[PDB]
């Protein structure tokens, strides 16, 4: 665990799990750099194969010119080039990417009145841009030290990442895979010729739910969706199907929504008023450290190409009402803030659930 990291693990390989707060921008570190003296014009190359250092230059430019110590020329033309006389020739130097990640212990197992502790991690080369913030990862890495300029000799620990394992992979457009192997192709083709295919796909939809066969047929049709059309005049016809299930409490509509969230390749289950801290539709908020407009989140946009299961669909804000309307026909959300103007994709099928007023339904 993150709390059992002691001073016995320093400069050792440790395997440790948690969740990721933030992924920093990619900094450019130097692997091979060519240098040339200011007035001596001595050309030299420094190759670097160690990039684990943080807050400090473990390999820097030489303090003095190397022409005198090498004695490369027999002519050997008191002359001093000066302190730090080398200039990096950038169009002949080679660079790699480096990233700062921030890892917290999981908030499920934290002391009740205490701050969750966190560590900074550094990754490089092909370990960068492999994980998004919020994913749960176990990471193998060197538990190392940097000095930051609270105790006469106190050092800040960090992790040099040697490997990242993703326990669970989030579902999104960019994380979706379109590659298929020939065995899965053959299995799907063999499945498609079954004459009772409709019956078995309806039976596979929530086998623990008694009845509601027409609802399960509707759910299969929603999962497939229809053909989308783009016409020469530019207006588009949508293929996604939006199904409302409204009825008495205790009729397993929420369980149908949950099963649709489980079976869909991309899905999000939210309430009519959103989530605890995840909005519905689309939220545009200012960036934390640079104060720039960006898309904060939202159920209808994270579930692009998927299904949003809106439980308690009748209780909903007026913002979310108009955004849901525009997303159900147009499959787009139009954002016109004071600084940002965009029309962003919301290609999502909506499966909504509702409980009518006065408790049970009234036939009158």
């Amino acid at each position: 665990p993150l709390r059992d990291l002691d001073s016995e693990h320093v400069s050792k390989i440790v395997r440790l799990s948690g969740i990721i707060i933030s992924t920093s921008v990619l900094s450019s570190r130097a692997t091979y750099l060519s240098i040339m003296c200011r007035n001596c014009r001595h050309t030299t190359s420094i190759t670097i194969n160690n990039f684990n250092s943080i807050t400090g230059n473990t390999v820097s430019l030489p303090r003095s010119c190397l022409s005198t110590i090498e004695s490369e020329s027999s002519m050997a033309n008191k002359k001093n080039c000066g302190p730090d006389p080398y200039i990096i020739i950038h169009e002949s130097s080679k660079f790699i990417d480096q990233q700062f990640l921030k890892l917290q212990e999981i908030p499920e197992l934290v002391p009740v009145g205490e701050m969750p502790r966190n560590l900074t991690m550094t990754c490089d080369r092909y370990l960068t841009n492999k994980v998004i913030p919020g994913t749960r990862v176990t990471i193998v890495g060197i538990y190392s030290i940097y000095n930051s300029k609270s105790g006469v000799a106190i050092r800040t620990p960090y992790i040099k990442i040697l490997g990242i394992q993703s326990d669970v992979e989030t579902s999104s457009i960019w994380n979706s895979v379109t590659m298929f192997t020939e065995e899965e192709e053959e299995e799907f083709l063999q499945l498609s010729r079954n004459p009772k295919l409709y019956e078995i796909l309806t039976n596979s939809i929530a086998p623990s739910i008694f009845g509601n066969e027409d609802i399960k047929k509707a759910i299969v049709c929603l999962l497939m969706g229809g053909s989308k059309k783009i016409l020469p005049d530019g207006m588009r016809l949508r293929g996604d199907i939006n199904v409302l299930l409204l009825g008495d409490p205790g009729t397993a509509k929420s369980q149908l929504l949950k099963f649709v969230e489980k079976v869909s390749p991309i899905a999000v289950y939210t309430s009519g008023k959103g989530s605890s801290a995840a909005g519905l539709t689309a939220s545009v908020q200012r960036d934390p450290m640079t104060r720039e407009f960006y898309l904060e989140g939202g159920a209808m946009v994270l579930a692009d190409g998927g299904v949003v299961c809106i439980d308690e669909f009748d209780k909903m804000r007026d913002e979310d009402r108009v955004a849901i309307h525009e997303a159900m026909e147009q499959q787009t959300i139009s954002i016109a803030k004071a600084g940002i103007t965009t029309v962003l994709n919301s290609r999502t099928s909506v499966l909504a659930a509702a409980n009518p007023i006065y408790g049970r339904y009234d036939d009158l």
């Binding site: 990721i20 921030k102 499920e108 989030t170 999000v268 605890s276 934390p288 989140g297 439980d311 409980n355």
Partner: protein, 97 residues
């Protein structure tokens, strides 16, 4: 997702529902709750999880927690002539859970 004003460090607080995972959450004064806390309780009893999309963090936290809540009836007294839903400001889906 809260940034300390002095430390300038972003931390992810799961809240009392995620923090009570595999345990019990005790919510005193369940009636005069605000809207965001009601939504958090609704999600924590429906999905037994809490989904966050804040500050670049989009994830779900397990909230498999039992809830022992305490509430006062409307007007300061229970009226036995009216049924339960009219004595409490809680709506039907949260009362049914």
């Amino acid at each position: 997702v809260r940034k300390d004003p002095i430390t300038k460090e972003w931390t992810l607080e799961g809240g009392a529902l995620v923090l009570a995972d595999k345990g019990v959450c005790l919510i005193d004064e369940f009636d005069k709750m605000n809207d965001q806390d009601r939504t958090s309780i609704h999600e924590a009893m429906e999905q037994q999880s809490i989904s966050i999309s804040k500050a670049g963090i989009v994830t779900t936290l397990q909230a498999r927690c039992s809830i022992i809540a305490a509430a006062n009836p409307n007007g300061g007294r229970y009226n036995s002539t009216l049924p339960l839903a009219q004595n409490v400001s809680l709506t039907e889906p949260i009362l049914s859970r």
